[PDB]
Amino acid sequence: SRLIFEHQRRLTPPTTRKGTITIEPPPQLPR
Amino acid sequence: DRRSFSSRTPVNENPDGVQYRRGFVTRHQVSGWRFVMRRIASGVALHDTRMLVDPLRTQSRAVLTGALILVTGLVGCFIFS
């Protein structure tokens, strides 16, 4: 009946750099 | 103090990171060009380029001042009539 299947290596899915980007604050209006 | 924001510039790593083709000389570039050509032109007449005192530009601005005072007196006596 049912043919057989093997256990390969799963294709590496595209990565996801889970970085934590840090924005720099703005200026303060000298006046 | 006033918390200034020093000019910064990172990368792009995407599609809109190489599309601009805009040629426009900024003030800094024209200043830099003036300075470079006045440090070369003072390296083949003075034979030292420490650039502490430049007399060549002094000469040229002197003749320019002559020209400007010329035109000033010209019109200031053109108003005389």
Curated annotation (Swiss-Prot), chain A:
UniProt-annotated location(s): Cell inner membrane
Coiled-coil stretches noted in the UniProt entry, renumbered to this chain: none
Domain of life: Bacteria
Disruption phenotype: Deletion of the gene impairs iron-bound mycobactin utilization and EsxG and EsxH export.
Signal peptide segment: none
Oligomeric and partner information: Part of the ESX-3 / type VII secretion system (T7SS), which is composed of cytosolic and membrane components. The ESX-3 membrane complex is composed of EccB3, EccC3, EccD3 and EccE3.
Function: Part of the ESX-3 specialized secretion system, which is required for siderophore-mediated iron acquisition and for the secretion of EsxH and EsxG.
Protein name: ESX-3 secretion system protein EccC3
Source organism of the structure: Mycolicibacterium smegmatis (strain ATCC 700084 / mc(2)155) (Mycobacterium smegmatis)
Gene assigned in the entry: eccC3
Swiss-Prot record, chain B:
Cysteine pairings via disulfide bonds: none
Region (Disordered): 1-18
Transmembrane parts of this sequence: 63-81
Location of the protein in the cell: Cell inner membrane
Role according to the record: An ATPase. Part of the ESX-3 specialized secretion system, which is required for siderophore-mediated iron acquisition and for the secretion of EsxH and EsxG.
Family: Belongs to the EccB family.
Subunit structure: Part of the ESX-3 / type VII secretion system (T7SS), which is composed of cytosolic and membrane components. The ESX-3 membrane complex is composed of EccB3, EccC3, EccD3 and EccE3.
Name of protein: ESX-3 secretion system ATPase EccB3
Organism of provenance: Mycolicibacterium smegmatis (strain ATCC 700084 / mc(2)155)
Parent sequence residues shown: 9 to 89 of 518
